[PDB]
Amino acid sequence: SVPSQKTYQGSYGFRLGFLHSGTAKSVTCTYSPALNKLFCQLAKTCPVQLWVDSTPPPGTRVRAMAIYKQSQHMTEVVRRCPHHERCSDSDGLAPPQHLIRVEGNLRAEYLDDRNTFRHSVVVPCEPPEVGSDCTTIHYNYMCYSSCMGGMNRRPILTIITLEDSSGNLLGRDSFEVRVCACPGRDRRTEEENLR
Ligand SMILES: Oc1c(Br)cc(Cl)cc1CN1CCC(N2CCC(O)CC2)CC1
Ligand SMILES: [Zn+2]
């Protein structure tokens, strides 16, 4: 099966936000609103903001999952390639097979779905730090889009879902991801192609 990617703000007015990091050749993570697409280097910090209109209940969680964007591939599980799944770069919590990690959150949980076999990482939904208006999760993507035997140049989407303590849907958002050597250059290129 294919998880839904339908944008759904739900009762709490849930949606994502991204920083404005620009497109300098040195940039390591940058988001394109025109493409709804995040461009990042391998295993680098990707700040993703969580915005809500009202506070969700205690026990609310935030799950991240990757799927292939193209329908002929949508049904295939997104996972790390045969090289990276064996390079012993574990953080002690993430299974070596998982493409998406949450950085610096000891309460992160990693799921191998016993039915779909799809991977996800989920964390408690926390309130913003005092003085802030949103909450930020830091993600890492642990393979290149180009990795052979893995994503193999196929575009993926990340689906972020807001869930209750049972795992029921409260909210959903999504964005395309390209993990590449030069995010700044590739964003500039793909935005120019769109134009
Ligand atoms: O922002 C989060 C996040 Br993200 C996660 C969690 Cl668990 C809790 C909060 C607390 N927020 C809730 C929404 C509050 N504003 C009410 C007025 C409206 O005009 C703007 C939104 C601000 C405080
Ligand atoms: Zn790889």
Swiss-Prot record:
Annotated consequence of substituting residue 146 to P: In sporadic cancers; somatic mutation
Instruction: Specify the species.
Output: Homo sapiens
Effect after changing residue 113 to E: In sporadic cancers; somatic mutation
Task: Give the result of residue 5 to R, as annotated.
Answer: In a sporadic cancer; somatic mutation
Describe the effect of residue 156 to N: In sporadic cancers; somatic mutation
Tell which residues of the whole protein are contained here. 96 to 290 of 393
The record lists the effect of residue 132 to T as: In LFS; germline mutation and in a sporadic cancer; somatic mutation
Annotated consequence of substituting residue 31 to N: In sporadic cancers; somatic mutation
Record annotation: effect of changing residue 146 to C: In sporadic cancers; somatic mutation
Q: What is the effect of changing residue 143 to F?
A: In sporadic cancers; somatic mutation
Upon changing residue 140 to D, the result is: In an adrenocortical carcinoma with no family history; germline mutation and in sporadic cancers; somatic mutation
Instruction: Describe what happens upon changing residue 98 to P.
Output: In sporadic cancers; somatic mutation
Result after altering residue 120 to C: In sporadic cancers; somatic mutation
Changing residue 174 to I has the effect of: In a sporadic cancer; somatic mutation
Give the result of residue 127 to S, as annotated: In sporadic cancers; somatic mutation
Result, substituting residue 162 to R: In sporadic cancers; somatic mutation
* Name listed for the protein in its UniProt record: Cellular tumor antigen p53
| Known outcome of mutating residue 149 to S | In sporadic cancers; somatic mutation
Q: What is the effect of changing residue 64 to G?
A: In sporadic cancers; somatic mutation
Q: What is the effect of changing residue 137 to S?
A: In sporadic cancers; somatic mutation; does not induce SNAI1 degradation
Mutating residue 188 to H: effect?
In a brain tumor with no family history; germline mutation and in sporadic cancers; somatic mutation
The role this protein plays is: Multifunctional transcription factor that induces cell cycle arrest, DNA repair or apoptosis upon binding to its target DNA sequence. Acts as a tumor suppressor in many tumor types; induces growth arrest or apoptosis depending on the physiological circumstances and cell type. Negatively regulates cell division by controlling expression of a set of genes required for this process. One of the activated genes is an inhibitor of cyclin-dependent kinases. Apoptosis induction seems to be mediated either by stimulation of BAX and FAS antigen expression, or by repression of Bcl-2 expression.
